[PDB]
Amino acid sequence: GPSSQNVTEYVVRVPKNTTKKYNIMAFNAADKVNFATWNQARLERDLSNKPEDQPWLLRVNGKSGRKFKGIKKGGVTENTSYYIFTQCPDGAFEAFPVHNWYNFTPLARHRTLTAEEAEEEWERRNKVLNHFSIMQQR
């Protein structure tokens, strides 16, 4: 059929100045996230610094949904480049350079052990028992 020997050739275009920036994004293979549930999102800079040189902090669906934190890529694009071919109705690819590579990681929302009480329980170096009871008291 036509699909067996399909022939495709589209023109590539590179704009010089673009008012909106691009960045590569990639979740971990084991995250197993869904995008339909992401009804609301809040992508704001972290408050731990106290601006452009700080990480972001993704907060999905307020406190109901999961939160994520990540860092910029250590490597620099001195020799490498990343281009994205955006689909358009006219069919001409529009290669777009990127500015940064980002990698957020999953975080679990639950009662977390605090540093001070961690020090308090550190006396039980290996004498600790009933791992549930560690969190039950807190």
Choose, by CB under 8 A, the member of 12, 14, 33, 41 that binds another protein: 41
Nearer to another protein among residue 41 and residue 71 (C-beta): 41
Q: Give me the 80-99 binding string for another protein, x by CB under 8 A, dash otherwise.
A: ----x-xx------------
Q: Are 66 and 109 in contact (CB under 8 A)?
A: yes
CB of 43 to another protein, least distance (A): 6
Q: How far is CA 95 from the centre of its chain?
A: 23
Long-range contacts of 10-19 (CB under 8 A, 24+ apart): 10/91, 10/92, 10/93, 11/92, 11/93, 12/85, 12/92, 12/93, 12/94, 12/95, 13/92, 13/93, 13/94, 13/95, 14/94, 14/95, 15/94, 15/96, 18/96
Q: Give me the 45-84 binding string for another protein, x by CB under 8 A, dash otherwise.
A: ---------------------------------------x
CB of 81 to another protein, least distance (A): 10
Summarize as ranges the residues that interact with another protein (CB under 8 A): 30, 32, 35, 41, 43, 84, 86-87, 106, 108, 110, 131
